[PDB]
Amino acid sequence: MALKRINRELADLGKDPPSSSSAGPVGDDLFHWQATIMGPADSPYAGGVFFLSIHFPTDYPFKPPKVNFTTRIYHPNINSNGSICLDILRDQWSPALTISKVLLSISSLLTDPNPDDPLVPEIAHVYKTDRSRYELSAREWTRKYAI
Amino acid sequence: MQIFVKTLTGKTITLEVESSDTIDNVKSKIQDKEGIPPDQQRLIFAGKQLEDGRTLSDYNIQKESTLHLVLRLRG
Amino acid sequence: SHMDEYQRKIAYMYDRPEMAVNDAQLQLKVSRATTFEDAYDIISKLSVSDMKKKLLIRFRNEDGLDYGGVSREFFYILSHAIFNPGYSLFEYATDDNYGLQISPLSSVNPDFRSYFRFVGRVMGLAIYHRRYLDVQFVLPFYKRILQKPLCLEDVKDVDEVYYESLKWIKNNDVDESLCLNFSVEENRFGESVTVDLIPNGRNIAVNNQNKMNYLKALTEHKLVTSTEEQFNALKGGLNELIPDSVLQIFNENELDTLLNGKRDIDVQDWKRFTDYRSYTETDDIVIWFWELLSEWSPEKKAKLLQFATGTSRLPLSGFKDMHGSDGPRKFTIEKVGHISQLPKAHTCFNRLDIPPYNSKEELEQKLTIAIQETAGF
């Protein structure tokens, strides 16, 4: 169940990719994936390429995968190391969530930060008070690191 | 007119709506069909999150558009 | 009254004619450094008659009075040694929710039966002599010890997300998109291997008619079938002293209280192993916070701990060895937010955001209100 599901997900990704995000195993290890996300056009991250590391637990699909950003991103809700944990409560992950939905959700987060849950207090304060400075800094970091 | 709302579980729900309908009314229809509370609905269209208080026409939603009901990642 | 009933049960249990300690005394010497080795060398050879005599424990090269304190310290050390995940006998249910359970990998040892019989003897000796361990197992463990049936809901205590996924499968329908079949992939020393819940199980997909059997098999495999021989040895060792007819008057909570005593959260350790962001150790909203935590009942402290860290269970070594979602993450207090807003919590980072209030009373009111929706213990 934890390997047939992964093979089906990989085949589906190779069937009809979202045309922006990509994902594939590194070398030969189906439980460790590397993914690529393109910066949304209508956001300061436009043009960047962000790499993610996905570790599927052995309990997959019952337990969610560990998704961690690798490229540094100036975002109000992404810590320095990068950690995208999915939690409104322990009531949102179900075996019916593929890995494509998670990538789409990550793109949504990139294009619409949530300021009411500040994981990085300084960036959240800048976003709330002065939006232009936040945009400038975000695009500067995208230029410096993502490219 | 008609539109399509694709959820998390890969299901596709087709709805009969009008361009003047509020976002709240659409979330209400999705709650009636899927049982998802409006407070937990995160609707995305063309990379932009639909906000309460506006209309579908504000987002240029036309015949047989496709929306996404997406996870609310926290960080 | 739960306490009155529990006290009646304890008195009745210890008043039985088959649980009377002899008047003779047994001397048991162990070195503090090598506690586990000497304890296993001595206890694993005692006869049942010998283990029922009065226990007089002495630490080598440490002469002192009040042998009760010495025995309590010895049992604390031994419990924190044998039940330590690093020894590959037990293991946390999950890294971010610390619940001890028998480790399936423990079978790799040449003879795990002797070690688990020793663990059973230690638990039975602690219960027999009115001494307490300090470990916190998962409820299915106590349910197995009492020989109770295990159902799906019991997975909630072990792992929350797994239980939620199983409940989702139970409620909603299952299509062929979910490549679910009667087999489980388990990673044993790097290599992953497939275990068939039923014969030829890896080639049978779960339909809408088989999903109930699939859930039953998953629950049984996760909770029971993976650790049969080890737990059988452990329970044999335990019943060596405490007959099964005496354990079966308690339930999964009274037995936990009998083993580990009334659970409580240490505050000195909490204060010594915490870190502050934008706060100094001498700031008013920190000294007031620690005073409030000092003058609080265990239930509310556990509620606050669950609100901040995510779970009310602590590691086996206090707040020092505390793990977040991504790795070690000590309890953190940070200055974030406006005065009016309630304190907030980042669960996956063990962070608590306390705005800069102006008086202790306001801090107490806000902190008590912010944790009402959270239930601990």
Briefly say what this structure is:
The complex is a heterotrimer of chains A (147), B (75) and C (377). With 147 residues, chain A is of the alpha+beta class.
Write the layout of secondary structure elements.
The complex is a heterotrimer of chains A (147), B (75) and C (377).
Chain A lengths: L3 H12 L6 E4 L6 E7 L10 E7 L10 E4 L29 H12 L10 H9 L1 H16 L1
Antiparallel strand pairs in A: 1-2, 2-3, 3-4
Helix pairs in contact in A: 3-4
Chain B lengths: L1 E5 L5 E5 L6 H12 L8 E3 L2 E2 L15 E5 L6
Parallel strand pairs in B: 1-5
Antiparallel strand pairs in B: 1-2, 3-4, 3-5
Chain C lengths: L1 H13 L7 E9 L4 H9 L4 H4 L1 E7 L7 H16 L7 E3 L7 E3 L9 H17 L10 H7 L9 H4 L1 H12 L11 E6 L2 E6 L14 H13 L4 H12 L4 H4 L6 H7 L7 H5 L1 E4 L6 H11 L3 H12 L21 E4 L9 E3 L4 E3 L6 H11 L7
Parallel strand pairs in C: 1-2, 7-8, 8-10
Antiparallel strand pairs in C: 3-4, 5-6, 9-10
Helix pairs in contact in C: 5-10
Organism (chain B): Schizosaccharomyces pombe (strain 972 / ATCC 24843) (Fission yeast)
Subcellular location (chain B): Cytoplasm; Nucleus
Protein name (chain B): Ubiquitin
Task: Name its key features.
heterotrimer, B: 75 residues, alpha+beta, Ubiquitin-like (UB roll), 5-stranded mixed sheet, 1 helix, globular, C: 377 residues, alpha/beta, Hect, E3 ligase catalytic domain fold, Hect, E3 ligase catalytic domain, Hect, E3 ligase catalytic fold, 4-stranded mixed sheet, two-stranded parallel ribbon
Gap between N and C termini of chain A: 38 Å
Give the CATH class of chain A: Alpha Beta
Helix/strand order of chain A, N-terminal first: HEEEEHHH
- Count of helical regions of chain A: 4
In what order do the strands lie side by side in the largest sheet of chain A? Answer: 1-2-3-4
By CATH, the superfamily of chain A comes out as Ubiquitin Conjugating Enzyme
Would you give an account of this structure?
The complex is a heterotrimer of chains A (about 150), B (about 80) and C (about 375). Chain A has one domain: Ubiquitin Conjugating Enzyme (Roll), CATH 3.10.110. Chain A is about 35% helix and about 15% strand. Chain A is built from four helices and four strands, in the order αββββααα. In chain A, α3 packs across α4. The longest helix of chain A has 16 residues. Chain B has a single domain, classed as Ubiquitin-like (UB roll), CATH 3.10.20.90. Chain B is about 15% helix and about 25% strand. Chain B contains one helix and five strands; from the N terminus they run ββαβββ. In chain B, a hairpin with a 5-residue loop joins β1 and β2. Chain C is an alpha/beta fold and about 375 residues long. Chain C has three domains: about 180 residues, Hect, E3 ligase catalytic domains (Hect, E3 ligase catalytic domain fold, Alpha-Beta Complex); about 70 residues, 2-Layer Sandwich (Hect, E3 ligase catalytic domain), CATH 3.30.2160; about 100 residues, Hect, E3 ligase catalytic domain (Hect, E3 ligase catalytic fold, 2-Layer Sandwich). Chain C is built from 16 helices and ten strands. Chain C has a four-stranded mixed beta sheet. A two-stranded parallel ribbon of chain C has the order 1-2. The longest helix of chain C has 17 residues. The two termini of chain C are about 15 Å apart. At the A-C interface, α1 of A face α8 and β5 of C.
